[PDB]
């Protein structure tokens, strides 16, 4: 039945990055888009694009990574080190603009839904709106 399509997507990306895939797909959905769109615009992913598995709308999400490392375990540093859903289905989180979180002292982002649209933490303050704190990413 799949509980939270969002947490899923976020997770799909986390599970994929760790193994360094080039792109994991995800079941398509308008609201899901924005998350990517922003997530990409800020520089967390090379990009995304609609696709189709055996007659099912999905989304390719081309992952970004750091350069190779020297020494034991040439594991390439991540571009997404951290990603986590805040407002869950079993606990909706809502914040006023006068109280929106600063992810990793500004290094990080905090995407969130709002009456004006899905916006970054900063863009939230920009247009001065609060909303459902979706998740943060750094």
């Amino acid at each position: 039945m799949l509980t939270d399509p969002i947490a899923d997507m976020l997770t799909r990306i986390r599970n994929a990055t760790r193994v360094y895939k080039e792109s994991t797909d995800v079941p398509a959905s308008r609201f899901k888009e924005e998350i990517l769109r922003i997530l990409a615009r800020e520089g967390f992913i090379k990009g995304y694009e609609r696709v189709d598995v055996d007659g099912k709308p999905y989304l390719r999400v081309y992952l970004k990574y750091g350069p190779r490392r020297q020494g034991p375990d040439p594991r390439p540093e991540q571009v997404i080190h951290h990603i986590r859903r805040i407002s869950k289905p079993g606990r909706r989180v809502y914040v006023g603009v006068k109280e929106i979180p600063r992810v990793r002292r500004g290094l990080g982002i905090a995407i969130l839904s709002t009456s004006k649209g899905v916006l970054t933490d900063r863009e939230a303050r920009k247009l001065g709106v609060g909303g459902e704190l979706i998740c943060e990413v750094w």
Binding site: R91, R92, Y94
Partner: protein, 99 residues
Amino acid sequence: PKKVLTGVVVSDKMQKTVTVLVERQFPHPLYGKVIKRSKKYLAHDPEEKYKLGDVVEIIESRPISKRKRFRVLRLVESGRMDLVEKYLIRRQNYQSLSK
């Protein structure tokens, strides 16, 4: 203002009177989650025009009786047993609690 609420008549087994059940959601004071609670008000129906299942607005009002301090404002929709069931099954399962 005379704050108005909205709920379904769950009882009409009374003269010129009806019982109205209304829920109200809200964020929990410590864990956020949008819990919901309800309450029964006794509404003054002078015509006995509002039967069971009717969803209705009811207004804060002059005392009518010990518990009647709300009048029936207007109809909202008729067929609504689905709700009446909820509250009635609730009463049911009480049988299966005592000892």
